[PDB]
A = this chain, B = another copy of it.
Amino acid sequence: GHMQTLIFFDMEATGLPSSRPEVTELCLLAVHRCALESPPTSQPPTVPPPPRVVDKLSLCVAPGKACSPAASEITGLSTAVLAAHGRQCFDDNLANLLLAFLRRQPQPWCLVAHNGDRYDFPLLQAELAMLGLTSALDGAFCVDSITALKALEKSYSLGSIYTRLYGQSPPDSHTAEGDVLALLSICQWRPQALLRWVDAHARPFGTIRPMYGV
């Protein structure tokens, strides 16, 4: 069936996959398909505005180890600073919060993340597995927006794509939320085509293996 909600998704972590990383930040931006299929008329901006009606969750997370120097430089986060801000680890309460947020969205749900198959999807699955919650998102679907945007269309970095589409760099905000918002803008460029591709290629989230095990 047709996806009813696209949940644009990006996470920050302590390092790249080969480091056995942990989540430091996540952003979920849930957009109803109607915002892409049937956007309201206006009486012509370079970049489409976000829909008026969206659900957004952006959370920082205390990892169980230090971020690498390279990770801190690109994400703007460090374990020490997260601790100063009283952040809690990836725990049961966080999993419940994520599920409660997702349950506010009409199903089927599709997570959309840029290079999601390499980064966000396996890391989320690994974090859930460490809590013993291996099937918590079996009901979700997912797509990788790099796969989608390649098929619809070079560098396929988010910034490269955005610049090619809108003739300007995206906002200067090196955060999970900034990345989600820029991805949404890209997905609104040709929204009906994007949505058709997602509906045709959405994959069950349960097919995503965890990045790592115990």
Contact = CB atoms under 8 A, between A and B. Distances in A.
A188 interface: no
Given A60-B53, A86-B4, A104 B96 contact: no
Contacts of A5: 86
Contacts of A70: none
Nearest to A98: B100
A73 to B, nearest CB: 13
Interface SS of chain A: helix, strand, loop or mixed?
A: mixed
Chain copies in the assembly?
Answer: 2
A4 B59 CA distance: 17
Contact of A177 (B4, B56, B60, B105): B56
Given A5-B86, A84-B34, A86-B5, A104 B54 contact: no
A88 B104 contact: yes
Contacts of A35: 85
Contact of A97 (B51, B77, B101): B101
B85 A53 contact: yes
Interface residues of A, number: 36
Contacts of A58: 54-56
Contacts of A51: 85
Nearest to A55: B59
Interface of A: 4-5, 32, 34-35, 51-60, 76-77, 81-82, 84-88, 93-94, 96-97, 100-101, 103-106, 175, 177
Given A55-B59, A56-B56, A56-B177, 11 more contacts: A5-B86, A34-B84, A52-B175, A53-B85, A54-B60, A56-B58, A59-B104, A93-B100, A93-B103, A93-B104, A96-B96
